[PDB]
Write a protein that binds this ligand. Sequence first.
Ligand code: R1Q
Ligand code: ANP
Ligand code: ANP
Ligand code: MG
Ligand code: MG
Length: 1218
Amino acid sequence: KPNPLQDANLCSRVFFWWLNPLFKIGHKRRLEEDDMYSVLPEDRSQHLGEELQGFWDKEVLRAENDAQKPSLTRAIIKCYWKSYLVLGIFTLIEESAKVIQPIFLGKIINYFENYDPMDSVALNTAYAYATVLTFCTLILAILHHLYFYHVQCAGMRLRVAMCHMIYRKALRLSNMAMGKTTTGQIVNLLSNDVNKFDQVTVFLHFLWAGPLQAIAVTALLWMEIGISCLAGMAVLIILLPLQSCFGKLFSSLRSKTATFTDARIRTMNEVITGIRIIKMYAWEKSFSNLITNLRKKEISKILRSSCLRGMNLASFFSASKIIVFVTFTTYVLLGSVITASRVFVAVTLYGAVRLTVTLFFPSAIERVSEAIVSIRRIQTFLLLDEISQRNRQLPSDGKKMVHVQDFTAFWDKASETPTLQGLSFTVRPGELLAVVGPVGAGKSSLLSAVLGELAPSHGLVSVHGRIAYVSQQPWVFSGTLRSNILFGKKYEKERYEKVIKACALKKDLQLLEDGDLTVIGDRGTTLSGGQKARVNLARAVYQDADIYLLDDPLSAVDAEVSRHLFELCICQILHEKITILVTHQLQYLKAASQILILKDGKMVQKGTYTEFLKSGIDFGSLLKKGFQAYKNYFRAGAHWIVFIFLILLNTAAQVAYVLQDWWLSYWANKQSMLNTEKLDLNWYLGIYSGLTVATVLFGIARSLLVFYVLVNSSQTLHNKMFESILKAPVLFFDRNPIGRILNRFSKDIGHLDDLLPLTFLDFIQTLLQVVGVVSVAVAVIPWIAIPLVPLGIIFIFLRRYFLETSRDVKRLESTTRSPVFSHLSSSLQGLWTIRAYKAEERCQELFDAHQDLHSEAWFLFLTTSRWFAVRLDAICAMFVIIVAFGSLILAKTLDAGQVGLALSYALTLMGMFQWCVRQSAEVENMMISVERVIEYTDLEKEAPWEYQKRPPPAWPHEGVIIFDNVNFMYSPGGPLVLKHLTALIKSQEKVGIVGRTGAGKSSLISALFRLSEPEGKIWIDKILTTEIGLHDLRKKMSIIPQEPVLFTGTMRKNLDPFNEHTDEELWNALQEVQLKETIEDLPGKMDTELAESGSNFSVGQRQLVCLARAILRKNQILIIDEATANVDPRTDELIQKKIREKFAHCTVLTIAHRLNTIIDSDKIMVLDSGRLKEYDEPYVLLQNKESLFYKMVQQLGKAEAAALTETAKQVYFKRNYP
Ligand SMILES: CC[C@]1(O)C[C@@H]2CN(CCc3c([nH]c4ccccc34)[C@@](C(=O)OC)(c3cc4c(cc3OC)N(C=O)[C@H]3[C@@](O)(C(=O)OC)[C@H](OC(C)=O)[C@]5(CC)C=CCN6CC[C@]43[C@@H]65)C2)C1
Ligand SMILES: Nc1ncnc2c1ncn2[C@@H]1O[C@H](COP(=O)(O)OP(=O)(O)NP(=O)(O)O)[C@@H](O)[C@H]1O
Ligand SMILES: Nc1ncnc2c1ncn2[C@@H]1O[C@H](COP(=O)(O)OP(=O)(O)NP(=O)(O)O)[C@@H](O)[C@H]1O
Ligand SMILES: [Mg+2]
Ligand SMILES: [Mg+2]
C-alpha cells in the first residue's frame, strides 16, 4: 500500500493534490481498510517508541546520577524541541501577517478619502496596497493548512510514542506492582489519558504568540486612534473574568443534574427489566409518577443551565459591538472627529485581538494544564517496580532439569504465614510429577515459583530449558484458533494436524463456521470454556518445550474429553519432556509417575501411586475440608407563530448588528462632507447608543427564545416516548433487548436535552453573521452578485463530494481503534503465560502493527479535513479579492465609508465560513437521535386499560373459569402454543398443572392475563375477558411468579404502591408471613431502601414478600407459577404450608415442575404440546397406567412414586369420602 504523499512535490503538498484518487474512490463506492494508505516510515510506531524510550532512559540515568526525580516533560522537550521550533517560526509569520493587513486596509480607505479622478500615481499605489492585502490573505488561507497538518502530526507522533512506551513497560510489570494496579487503569491511560497529546500541540505555540500579538495590536491602536483605545482594551480584559465565572457556575449547575439523571436512568432500567411483572401487577401508573417527578426535577436544572449558556452566547455576540461603542464614544467625547481610515482599522484590529485574547489563550492554558496532568500520570506509571530480568544462568552441562532447594517466599511481606515452607525437590525428563491438595495448598504458588514469578526470599531455584506452562484459567487472545495454537510460530501443517487429532479438537472446529480459522474475540465470546482449555493445552503441547507445567487442566471438561486428553496428549506425547502437573481428579493419579501431597503450603508425602496406596492415607479423605424530522422536532416545541416571532427576532438582531457599523460609516461620511460649523453630537451619539442597546437586547432575546423552544421540544418528545413505552405489548419487549430500549432513554434524550439546542443556536448565529457579511458586500457593490452564483454552486458540489468520503474515513478510524485496547487487555490478562515463553517481543510487534493500523486512518482523517479546508479558504479568498479589487475598479461611484465597511466585513468572513460549514455538518449528524426518539414515539399500542362498560365492583363473586377453544400464539404468524383448550374450573378448587418442560404450562397465565391477545373465549363469573380493559381484568387475579422481584424503594412502597391499605394491616400481613420481626430490626422501621431486586434479601425472603403481596391484595383468584426451584427445604415447606392454609376459600391454580407440591390438588391438567389430554382427580389418573400422569410418576422412580400414589389416595379418601 504505497503512500502518494512520499511522491508529491511542494506544490502538490500545499494544495493536498495527492488525495484526489482517494476522494474519487470514496465517491464511487465504500472505503475499506484495503483502500487506506500505509504510514510513512518516520511515523511507524516502533521508531517513535524506541526514540522516545532512549531519550527517557538517558534522562532517567542522568536524574538518578544527580539524585533527583526524573522528568518525562524534560525528556519530551529534549526530543521534540528541534522539530517544534520551525512551526513556531511559521506561526510568528502568520500572526505578523494577521496584525499587518489592517494597515493596508486603512491605506486603501485613505486613498479613497482623498480621491482625485485625474491622478494616477495614487491609483497605482492603491493597486499595490490591494495586491499586498491579497498576498496576506493568501498567506493566511493557503499555507496555514499545511502548517496545521504538521502541527497535528507532531501530537500524533507524541501520542504513538507514549502508547508504545506504556505497553513496553506494562509487558514487564512485577507481581506486586500488578497487584497494586488494575487492567482498567492501564486501558484508561491509553483510551483517555493519552489523547490529550493530540490537542496540546495545536494551541501550544499561542502561549508566546498571544501576549505578543496583543502588545503589537495595542501599539498599532495607540499609533492610529490615540488614548481612546484603552477603554476598548479594558473592556476586552474584563471579558475574561466574566467567562471564568460563567464556566465556574455552569459546571456546578451541570453536576447538580446528574444526581437526577442517573436516578431516572436506574428507574427506567428497573422498569424495562421487570416489565412483565409490572404489567401483571398493573403498577405502570406508580412507575409513571416516579419517572415524571424525576424528569421534572432534572428538567428544571437543564433549563437553568440552558439559560446560562444562552446568556454566554449573547455576551459573545454583543462583545464586539460594546467594545467598539465604548472606544469611539470616548474618542469622540475627547474632542476628535470620525474618519473612515481610522474607524474601520480600529474595528479590524479590535476583532482580531478580541478573538486571540478571548479564545486562543484560555484554550491553550486549559490544554497545557490537561497535558501536564496526563504527563504526570504516565510518568508515575513508568516507574513502577518491574521484574528483574532473568540474569546470567548458572553454568550447567546442558542437561534439562528442574531443581528447588530451601525455597521460602511470600507474595506479601506483611503475612504471618509464608506461602511456601522450605520446598526442596527436583524433577528430570520423563517424570510425571503430580501435586495433590485442597484449595489453598499452594500448588499454583509452586508452579509460579518454578517460573520465577515468586522472588526467592531464601533458597535457590535452578531451572534450565524451555518451559511449557498451563494456566489455571484458559486464555485466548485477539486472533484465531489457529493463531492461538501457533502462538506466532511458523505454521507446520503436519504438526498442527497431529496436535489437533491428539487433542480431539475436530468437533470444536466443526462447530465453527470457518473451522480452525474462526476469529475468537475477548474472553472467547465465540467459544466456550472447554474449548478454551483444549486450545490452551494444544498450544502448550504444540510449542514443544523441554519442561511442561500443568495446573488444573481437566476440571471444567467432560469425562471422555478429559480422559482422552490426559492419555494421548500427556502420557504418550510428553513422555520425553519434564512434566509437573496439578490435579483434582483421582482417576488420573494412577498414570502419574510421581505424586506429591501439599497442604497449608507444607510438604506431606511424595512417591508413586503404589507407595501412596501402601501409605494408607486416602486422597479423598485429605481432599475434604430528512425534512419531516426537522418539522416534527420544531413542532414539538411550540406553535408556528412562535417560529415566525423567532425568525423576526433573528432578523432584527442581525439588522441592528449591521446597522451600527453602517451608522458609523454614515457619520464618517457626513463629517467628511463638511466645510467653524460642527456636527450635532447629541443626535449621532444618541442613535449610536440606541443601536448598540437594540443589538444587545435582540441578541439576548433570540438566544433565550431558541433555547426555551428547543428544550420544551425535548421534554415533550421524552414524555411522548415514555407514554408510548409504558403501553407497548410484551411482544415488543421480547423483540427488543433491554440495552436497546435503555439506549434511547439514556443517550438520545441526553443529546436532545443539552447538546442539540446549543449547537442549533451557535449554527444559526454563525450562519446569520455570514449572511450579513454577504448582504453588506452585495449592497455596497451590486455587481458582486454575479460570481456568487457560481461560487455557491461550486460550494454545494464540493460539500457533497467531501461528505461522500469523510463519513467513511470517520467510520474507518472508529472501527480501527478498538483492537489496540483488546490486545492490551488480552496481553495483560495472560501476562504470566506470555512471559513463560520468551515470546514477548512478538507481542510487542503485534501491538505495533495494531497501532500502525489506527495511525493509518488517523492520517487520512487529518489529510481529508485539510483537503476540504483548503478549497473552502480558496473560495473565501476569491470573494475577498473580488470585493477589494471591484471597490478600486469602481472608485468613481463608492466612497470611503462604504468601501471601508464592505472591506472590513469581507475580511471578517474568514473562519466564520468554515465554522458555519462544520456546525451544519455536526447538526446533520446529531439529528439521528431525534429520528430515533420520534421512531420510538409511535410504537404499537395494546388494548386500553379501561372500557366504557365496567363490570360490577364485586366481580369476581365466585371464581368460575371457562376455557373454550383457546388458540394462543405469542406472535402473529408464529407457531401455535395452545390447541383448542376446553375446560371448566369450579370455584374454590385447587388445580395442579403438569406436563413436559415444553408442554405450555406457563402459557396459560399469558392467555388468562391477555398479555398477548389470545384466540377464543374465556369466561370468568360470566364475563368475557375480551370486553373489559386490561387494568380492570388483571387487578382481580393475583400472580406469584417464578423469580420474585423487589423494586428499589420503601417496604410500604413494595407492599402497597397505591397507599390503599393501612400500616396495621401491613404489619398483620407481615406477621402472617413471619417476616415482621425481620422487617422491624433495620435502621428504619418500614422505610429501608434496598438494592437491585433486594440483593441483600434472600430468595426465600423475596418469595415470602410476594406471598405477603398476594395476601394484601386478597383477591379471589390466585395463581402460582414455579414457586420453589432452588430454595432451601425449610423455606419451601414454609411457603407451601402458608399458601395451603391462607387461601382456603380462594380459587388457586398452581404450576409446579415437581409433583410433591401439587399431589393434593383436586384436579390436574395434562398438557401434551399444547393439547389438553386429561382433566380429573389425580387418583383417577393414577388408576389408569396409560395416563401421562402415571407415566411421569413412574419416570421419577419407585419409592417417590409409591409415596405420591399413597398421598393422592389419602387425599381422595379424605375429601370425597368423609
Ligand atoms: C465560552 C464562550 C465561547 O463558547 C468560546 C468559544 C467562542 N464561542 C463563540 C462561538 C465559537 C466557538 N468557536 C468558534 C470558532 C469560530 C467562530 C465562532 C466560534 C466556540 C463556542 O463555544 O461556540 C459556542 C466553540 C464551540 C464548540 C467547539 C469549539 C469552539 O471553539 C474552538 N467544539 C468543537 O468540537 C464544540 C464542542 O461541542 C466540543 O468540543 O465537542 C467535542 C464544545 O464542547 C466542548 C466540551 O468543548 C462546545 C463548546 C464548549 C459545547 C457544546 C456545543 N458545542 C457546539 C460546538 C462546540 C460546542 C468557543 C463562545
Ligand atoms: N499472584 C498471587 N498474588 C498474591 N497472592 C497469591 C498469588 N498466587 C497465590 N497467592 C496466595 O497464595 C496462597 C496459596 O495460593 P494457591 O494455593 O496456589 O492458590 P490456588 O491455586 O487457588 N489454590 P491451589 O489450587 O490448592 O494451589 C493463597 O493465600 C493465595 O491468595
Ligand atoms: N415469549 C415467547 N415467545 C414465543 N414462544 C415462547 C415464548 N415463551 C415461551 N415460548 C415457547 O412456547 C412454548 C410454551 O411453553 P412454556 O410457556 O415455557 O410453558 P412451560 O415450559 O411448560 N412452563 P416453563 O418451563 O416454566 O416456561 C414452549 O415451546 C416455549 O419455548
Ligand atoms: Mg494452585
Ligand atoms: Mg412456560
